[PDB]
Every structure is written in structure tokens, then in C-alpha cells.
Amino acid sequence: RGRIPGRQWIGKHRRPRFVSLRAKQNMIRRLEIEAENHYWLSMPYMTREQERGHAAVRRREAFEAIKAAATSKFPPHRFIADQLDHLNVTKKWS
Amino acid sequence: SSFSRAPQQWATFARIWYLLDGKMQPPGKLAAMASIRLQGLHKPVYHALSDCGDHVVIM
Amino acid sequence: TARGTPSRFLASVLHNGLGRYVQQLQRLSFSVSRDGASSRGAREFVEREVIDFARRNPGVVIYVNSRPCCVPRVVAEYLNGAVREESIHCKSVEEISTLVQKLADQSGLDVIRIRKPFHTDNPSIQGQWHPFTNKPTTFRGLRPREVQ
Amino acid sequence: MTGKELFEMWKIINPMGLLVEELKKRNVSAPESRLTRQSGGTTALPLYFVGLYCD
Amino acid sequence: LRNRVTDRYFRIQEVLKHARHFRGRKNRCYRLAVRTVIRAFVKCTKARYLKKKNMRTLWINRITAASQEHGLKYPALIGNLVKCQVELNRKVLADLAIYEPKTFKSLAALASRRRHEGFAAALGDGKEPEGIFSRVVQYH
Amino acid sequence: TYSPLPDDYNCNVELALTSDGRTIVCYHPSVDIPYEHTKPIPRPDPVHNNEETHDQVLKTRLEEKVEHLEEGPMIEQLSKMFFTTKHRWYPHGRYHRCRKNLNPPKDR
Amino acid sequence: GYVPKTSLSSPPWPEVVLPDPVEETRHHAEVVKKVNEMIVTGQYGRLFAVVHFASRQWKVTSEDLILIGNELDLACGERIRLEKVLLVGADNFTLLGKPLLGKDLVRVEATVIEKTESWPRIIMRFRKRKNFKKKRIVTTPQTVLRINSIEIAPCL
Ligand SMILES: [Mg+2]
């Protein structure tokens, strides 16, 4: 008898939903966290002119390491030991 | 105790008869307690397959 | 699947840890081949680590048969009559050593579903719960709606 | 003996007589049995708790 | 017919040995047995989450039963046991409720004492002793 | 004085805190059921099988109890006696009868 | 601040008066003394403990077995002291930690009895109409511990 037109939660006529106490309290506590975040993002420490180049050396070194890893690429070494010890497959009593 | 095992089991899983009174009580508040003690949800030994239900006599 | 397999409870063999611990492994019997690529790990295990294993635990009797076989094997026999057979076919020496150490570590009980991983024989000390625990008494034991 | 009750290795026959003579040895007068608890008497599944009282 | 399959029976048995306890034609016929065994193994894998959840629910029910036997409520008991710094989980709490009723009564009494102390604290802001089963122990 | 829980059932609980304050001590001896709270065991001695002529006529009369019922009334009687439902007492097929474990695992 | 008695004038719950702190401190002292003298005389038998071990809490007593789901790097037959005891109870008394009891108070011993693996556990993944089917078999390591003794010391 209580019939909603097709696909309850989409369309022109939808099944109504209402907000409980849970949802309001959850929203309020997340808003409180956000407000405290706003507070703590309000007092910087280096005013954007004092941070001009304080990490440039370290970032350059990091990218140099990245490039060294990217360019140190080559086929691995090949040894006589593996080719010769494949002969151990037929090692009988000795 | 030390309760030889068969008497111990019988005592643990024995059925209890409870008396509950109507006389101006709300039927649903009576039914809540009746359902609890008919299912056996009032015993720390409760399980669904243990058949640990009790008798409720509502007058 | 548990519903498609047997089950048992956690248990010991003869109350192993109560008095003295005893090694439940009784015998290890090895079938290894003189020739044959599959018995090479077993061959080197017998060459090096079988003697040290026997010296390490002397409650276990180890036999090595050295017969022509396509599949080398180890048979573990336990004090409770349990027999377990394992294939050491085409296994490395470290694999075989781990296998034999595991065999010496286990007991003879079946490796099936264990069903409640604890076994207490005295589950209650203050008395098991019954519907009359936590229930007060009445004068003269008078049940509800009584007269005398 | 672990996990076994005393009367699973002794296998006594008359516990009341044994207790009576033990109390006679210990100079304890007599145990009288009283119904301490009960739940259902007219049903096929009764529960009785009987307590023994000495003096 | 160069190299046709010879050991198909052993693969059929590999699937069929997990269907022996089924009912109907799916305990013997591979075409239906394979589907039902696939579903059974998926159920076996998914059932671990439900086993954990259901065992925790059983512990909660048993603890609620015992606490109501002692007159307490489950949230009050759990919260005040946390506040007394006694960190027993639902499993061992139900274990004690079934097998150590004296210990469980002592635990419920301690939780009720802590709850009353919390009420007195909410009334009087400490002033002086802030309760005795309060006073958490500090660690460094 | 003050008690968190009533000390008349199952325990006499006292809660203490050590001087160091790091451990809680719970003392809880058992409470006995007092004699005034018990009733005497009944002693029924029914003897009405003695007629003035014989003495083994009552021994014969002792084996006079026998009764047979069909499935319907028997199941109704069992259900009434054990406060169960009728479905408990109908039989099961051979499949269910033979797929039941007759040697189940034993704990304790 | 006076209100005539009604159904809402006063809270439904009873009014609770907690005991006075100094007399309660003396009462706690005497209760701890009584429990300690019971311990020194040996008025206990067959006590149990709750032990935190391998991310789990175990209700152990003497003589029983515990199965823990990983290796321990111990030989079979090795005796071990099980620390992290948070409850120990005998008949008529119980000791609680906040959250752990002291080292000097309790001493739980356990011997390693069996090192094994579990039965095979099937891990099957399936999605319909997607050709999505995967299967694993896992056997986790396992250790069996036999609890030998739970001792208590008068240092209360
Ligand atoms: Mg629709």
C-alpha cells in the first residue's frame, strides 16, 4: 500500500529520509574538529619569505638520488658457477 | 560443590518457573520480560541451540 | 570445510607437560635412492644432517633403507600408534631439515580442526553457574503465593 | 588422576551411611537433610537442591 | 589422437571428495558438484568475519545477562570497568560470568562503586578525594 | 554502612585498594543457606495394596500397570508432558538418521 | 530550595552516600591485611589467572592447555614464565591489576608441549559473470602450552 515509484532513492518522487540524533551529533563533532583545524592553521611560523630556500638543497639531493636509481639500470651479472652447478642434477653416490 | 557431572549439568540447565502479574501493567512491558525469560536471555549460559528457556506464568 | 571434515578437541597424549616432557616422535624411516635425481636432497641430508639429528634427539630411532625409488619418502611413527608418511621428492636439504624438525616437534594427534583452542579440566573454581546462583532465599523456603 | 572425581575411582555404594559413620568418628551428631531449593515438582523435569545440616 | 587426457578421473575426484556430504545429484555429478563446492568454499572463506562477530555478540549477550542478574547494565559495567583500568575483554568477562560467579559479582560491585563515584564527582567536582577507585595510575 | 551490591546472595563482597594503589583486592566468601530458610523433605509412604487374605497378591498387582497409545495421542501426551511442540516426536528419514555422528568428540 | 513531594520532585533512583574516605582507607588496609594473611597461611587452593598473551587474554588454571596461533622460537619441553597477569582469583578472594598485576605477586609457568601447523584453511574468491575465481590453502603455525603452576607471594 505504501508504494514509492521506481527506484526509491532516485527520481522525482523519492522515499523521504529524516535526520536522527545520531547524524546531527556526528555532524556537530566533525564540525568541531574542522573548527579546531581552522584555529591551528592560523599561526604560521616562517611568513613565506623565510621559507624561500630552506629545503632546496635536500630536495635537489632527493631528486639526484631518484635520477641515480633511474639511470643505474643494466642486466645483472652472469657467473660460471650456476651454469656449472646445473650439472649436479645427476650426482649419484660418490 | 564438586557436584558429580550429571547432577551438575542438570542443575545448570534446569528450567525455572517465573510468576508475573498483570493488574494495570502495560502488555508490551510484560511481553519484554516474558520474551527475555522465554528465550533464556537472562542466563549467562545462554545459547540459541542450548534450549535454555524458562516458564513464564502471567496472571 | 569444517562441515565436510572431521574434528576433535585440544588434548595431549599422556599428559605430556604435567610431569616430564617426552618426545612423541618414535621412529623416522627414510627411503632414499642411490641413483635418481629426485633423491638428491635426501642424499645430501643423509650425508650431512641425519647424524647430527640423531645425536640431537636419541629418543627417536632413524632408519635409512637406500633402495631404488622414484619418490623418496620419510615415515614418522609416534608413541600413540600414529603413522605419518611424507614425500621428500625433489626437495632441498633445508626443506628436508625443516620437515624432519617439524615432524619431531609435532605429536601424533590428527591435524584436523581443533574446536575451541583450549582444554581446561577444571573450568570452574568458585562453582559453575546454575539458575539458583545469584538468587536469594525466602523464609521457610516459601515459594511465591504460598500460605504456610 | 587429573580431571577425575573421587567417586569415579572409589565407586562407593552408600554415601549417606559412609557420611554418617564418618561423622560418628568425628564426634558429629547427625546430618539432617532439608530441601534448600526446588523448581518444578509437578513436572517431568524437576530440580531439587538438598542441604545436609549438622547441628 | 596425440596425447589426450588420461587422468581426468583424479581431477573429477579432487572436486567430488568435497561434495560427498551434499544432498541430491550434486554429491555425484560433477557439473553440479563443482558449482556447489565453489559456493561452499566461498562461504567457508567468508564465514570467518561472521564467526568473530557472532562470538562477540554471544559474549555481549552473556555479559548483559550476568550484569542484569547483579542489577547492573552492560554499558555501565563495561564503561566503569574501563574507568577502573581493569582491561578484561568480553570473552573473559563471559568466561568469569559462567564459571566464576563470585569474581563476576566482585567485578559488578566494583563497577557499581565506580559508577557511584562518578555520579558523586559530577555532583561535587572532586572536593576533596575525587573517589578511591578513581585515581588512575600513571605510566611513563 | 554502604554496600554496592546486596550481601545476601552468592557472596559477601568487600573491595579494597592496597596502599600502593596498583592492585584491587576483592574478598568474597560464600554465603550459606540458613536453616530458617529451608523446608523439610517430605516422606511419602503410600501403602494401600494390602488385602486381608494374601501377601503376594500385591506382588502380582505391582505389575498391573501397562498402556499403549497410537502416534497421535502418544505425541500429544509427550508434548503436554514436556511442554514441547508436536514436531519434536515425529521420526526422521534414513538419510538424516545415518548422517548423524554416533561417536562425537568428547570434551572433559 | 524546597519542593513539595511529587512524582518528579526527586530523582527516581535512591540517594547513595559513599563512605568517609579515611575510615574507608583503614577498612581497605584491614581487608588487604586479612587477604594477605590468608595468602601467607595458605588458605587457598586451585586458583586461576587471566593472562594477556599473543594479543589474546586467556582464562587459565593449572594443568590445562592453550593453543596459540603462531611460532614462539622455543623448543618443545621449554619452561616459560607467562608475564602480563591482570587477574588472579582463588576461592574467596580475587586480585586485580591496573591493568597488570605486579611481577612479585603472581608467577604463572607454562611449558611448550607441541609445535605444529593447523589444518588447511581454504581461501576461495569468486565473482559471477566475471571469470573471477581464485583459491588458496593456508596452514598457520601453532604452539601448545601446558600451564604448570600459578604461584602467589605474600608481597601484597
Ligand atoms: Mg520500484
Swiss-Prot record, chain C:
Name this polypeptide is given: Large ribosomal subunit protein mL43
What is the predominant subcellular site recorded for this chain? mitochondrion
Family per UniProt? Answer: Belongs to the mitochondrion-specific ribosomal protein mL43 family.
Q: Name one GO biological process term.
A: translation
Q: Which UniProt keywords apply?
A: Mitochondrion, Ribonucleoprotein, Ribosomal protein, Transit peptide
- GO CC aspect terms: mitochondrial inner membrane; mitochondrial large ribosomal subunit; mitochondrial ribosome; mitochondrion
Known tissue expression: High relative levels in skeletal muscle and testis. Lower levels of expression in the heart, brain, placenta, lung, liver, kidney, pancreas, spleen, thymus, prostate, ovary, small intestine, colon and leukocytes. Expression is coregulated with TWNK.
For this chain, one GO molecular function annotation is: RNA binding
Where in or outside the cell it occurs: the entry states:
Mitochondrion
The subunit field of the Swiss-Prot or TrEMBL record says: Component of the mitochondrial large ribosomal subunit (mt-LSU). Mature mammalian 55S mitochondrial ribosomes consist of a small (28S) and a large (39S) subunit. The 28S small subunit contains a 12S ribosomal RNA (12S mt-rRNA) and 30 different proteins. The 39S large subunit contains a 16S rRNA (16S mt-rRNA), a copy of mitochondrial valine transfer RNA (mt-tRNA(Val)), which plays an integral structural role, and 52 different proteins.
From Swiss-Prot, chain D:
Question: What is its quaternary makeup?
Answer: Component of the mitochondrial large ribosomal subunit (mt-LSU). Mature mammalian 55S mitochondrial ribosomes consist of a small (28S) and a large (39S) subunit. The 28S small subunit contains a 12S ribosomal RNA (12S mt-rRNA) and 30 different proteins. The 39S large subunit contains a 16S rRNA (16S mt-rRNA), a copy of mitochondrial valine transfer RNA (mt-tRNA(Val)), which plays an integral structural role, and 52 different proteins.
What family does this belong to? Belongs to the ribonuclease III family. Mitochondrion-specific ribosomal protein mL44 subfamily.
Which organism was this protein described from?
Answer: Homo sapiens (Human)
The entry's protein name is: Large ribosomal subunit protein mL44
> Where is it localised?
Mitochondrion
Function in brief: Component of the 39S subunit of mitochondrial ribosome. May have a function in the assembly/stability of nascent mitochondrial polypeptides exiting the ribosome.
Highest taxon above the source species? Eukaryota
Q: Which disease is it linked to?
A: Combined oxidative phosphorylation deficiency 16: An autosomal recessive, mitochondrial disorder characterized by hypertrophic cardiomyopathy, liver steatosis, and decreased levels of mitochondrial complexes I and IV in heart and skeletal muscle.
UniProtKB/Swiss-Prot annotation, chain E:
Q: Name one GO molecular function term.
A: structural constituent of ribosome
Gene3D superfamilies from the UniProt entry: Ribosomal protein L20
Q: Could you say which protein family the record assigns here?
A: Belongs to the bacterial ribosomal protein bL20 family.
In Swiss-Prot or TrEMBL terms, this protein is called Large ribosomal subunit protein bL20m
Q: Where in the cell is it found?
A: Mitochondrion
User: What biological-process terms (Gene Ontology) are attached?
Assistant: mitochondrial translation
Q: Does the keyword Transit peptide apply?
A: yes
- Keywords for this entry? Mitochondrion, Ribonucleoprotein, Ribosomal protein, Transit peptide
> Gene encoding this polypeptide?
MRPL20
Top-down, what is the taxonomic lineage of the species of origin? Eukaryota, Metazoa, Chordata, Craniata, Vertebrata
The keyword Phosphoprotein belongs to this UniProt entry's keyword annotation? no
Listed GO cellular component terms?
A: mitochondrial inner membrane; mitochondrial large ribosomal subunit; mitochondrial ribosome; mitochondrion
Subunit organization: Component of the mitochondrial large ribosomal subunit (mt-LSU). Mature mammalian 55S mitochondrial ribosomes consist of a small (28S) and a large (39S) subunit. The 28S small subunit contains a 12S ribosomal RNA (12S mt-rRNA) and 30 different proteins. The 39S large subunit contains a 16S rRNA (16S mt-rRNA), a copy of mitochondrial valine transfer RNA (mt-tRNA(Val)), which plays an integral structural role, and 52 different proteins. Interacts with OXA1L.
UniProtKB/Swiss-Prot annotation, chain F:
One Gene Ontology cellular component annotation held by this UniProt entry:
mitochondrial small ribosomal subunit
Q: Name a single GO biological process.
A: mitochondrial translation
- The yes or no answer to whether the keyword Ribosomal protein is present is yes
Q: Which GO molecular function, any one, fits this protein according to its record?
A: RNA binding
The regions listed as transmembrane in this protein's record are none
Localization of this protein: Mitochondrion
Keywords carried by this UniProt record: Mitochondrion, Ribonucleoprotein, Ribosomal protein, Transit peptide
Primary localization:
mitochondrion
Per UniProt, subunit arrangement is: Component of the mitochondrial large ribosomal subunit (mt-LSU). Mature mammalian 55S mitochondrial ribosomes consist of a small (28S) and a large (39S) subunit. The 28S small subunit contains a 12S ribosomal RNA (12S mt-rRNA) and 30 different proteins. The 39S large subunit contains a 16S rRNA (16S mt-rRNA), a copy of mitochondrial valine transfer RNA (mt-tRNA(Val)), which plays an integral structural role, and 52 different proteins.
Q: Which family does it belong to?
A: Belongs to the mitochondrion-specific ribosomal protein mL42 family.
What's the name of the protein?
A: Large ribosomal subunit protein mL42
The source organism is Homo sapiens (Human)
